[PDB]
A paper describes a structure:
These proteins are crucial for selective autophagy and recruit proteins bearing LC3-interacting region ([name]) motifs. Many mATG8-interacting proteins contain canonical [name] motifs that have a basic hydrophobic [name] motif with a core consensus sequence of (W/F/Y)-X-X-(L/I/V), which binds to the W- and L-sites conserved in mATG8 proteins using the amino acids W/F/Y and L/I/V, respectively. In this study, we identified [name] motifs specific to the membrane-anchored form of each mATG8 and characterized the residues critical for their selective interaction using cell-based assays and structural analyses.
Isothermal titration calorimetry (ITC) experiments further confirmed the strong and specific binding affinity of [name](Sp) to [name]; the dissociation constant (Kd) of [name](Sp) to [name] was 0.24 μM, which was 8–12 times lower than that to GABARAP (1.8 μM) and GABARAPL1 (2.9 μM). The structure of the [name](Sp)-[name] complex is similar to that of the [name](Sp)-SpAtg8 complex. The helix formed extensive hydrophobic interactions with V51, P52, I55, W62, and I63 of [name] using M394, L397, Y398, A401, and M404. Among these, Y398 formed the most critical interaction, as it was inserted deep into the L-site pocket of [name]. In addition to hydrophobic interactions, three acidic residues of [name](Sp), D391, E393, and E395, formed electrostatic interactions with K46, R67, and R28 in [name], respectively. Although most of the interactions were similar to those in the [name](Sp)-SpATG8 structure, F388 of SpHfl1 was not inserted into the W-site of [name].
Author numbering:
A (entry chain A), B (entry chain A): 1 to 21, 26 to 144
Write the structure that this text describes.
């Protein structure tokens, strides 16, 4: 328009862009149509597997995971899948880990099949975030 | 204007309003100026106490807490304060509890004084949310 201003909405995008040598998410990489087609294929081909996308909570200080797409046996429990993720990122047992579905911590005795049927995304994947504890950069 | 529509922004407010016999938050109850004055008074009068507001994560199925404002000794650790909250809501040890500061889980060996100096609100209080595990209404 006529006036202008340092757009506070854009400033985080500029700051994030300057730190590029891209950790884009599964949803940012693939259209909704493509994700829907893919999850339908997975469910047709592997009826007892739940397609899960695992991503670190944005900004968490825990190490990132090398693999984000998992075809998980439906009878695996939340606790068991948490152990699998812990093994994948090699987080020592003494350090806590947390899984989040819809920004809450799923009860650990639920199966991934239960959680999938109730909490799957519109695109047919179950999205699971993980983090550790936050030290806020303080002396622990 | 000229046109109209069932405002999706307002519909959750209508639905929430119909469930009234009000669980408003500390910030919703008190102006920013009043909160700033009060926390400054607390810090002047009790130099080794951190003023903490404890509130259940919105929508969590865990029981609500009867008391939200705490003047916590600064050398109390996060783990110890979690135990205090657990006692206050009488949550059995077998059920998990989580504390959140700025939407993350604070490291359990930090003191409330450390967490206060780093993560206090602009209004001078430390805001701590708590929840349990989410069963998503499923059979546990």
């Amino acid at each position: 328009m006529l006036q202008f201003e340092i757009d506070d909405e854009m400033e985080p995008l500029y700051n994030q862009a300057k730190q590029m040598r891209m950790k884009s998410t599964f949803k940012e990489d693939h259209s909704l149509e493509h994700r829907c087609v893919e999850s339908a294929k997975i469910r047709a081909k592997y009826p007892d597997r739940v397609p899960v996308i695992v991503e670190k909570v944005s900004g968490s200080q825990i190490v990132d995971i090398d693999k984000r797409k998992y075809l998980v046996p439906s009878d695996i429990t939340v606790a068991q899948f948490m152990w699998i993720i812990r093994k994948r990122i090699q987080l020592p047992s003494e350090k806590a880990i947390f899984l989040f579905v819809d920004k809450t911590v799923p009860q650990s005795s639920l199966t991934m099949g239960q959680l999938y049927e109730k909490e799957k995304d519109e695109d047919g994947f179950l999205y699971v975030a993980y983090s550790g504890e936050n030290t806020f950069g303080l002396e622990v």
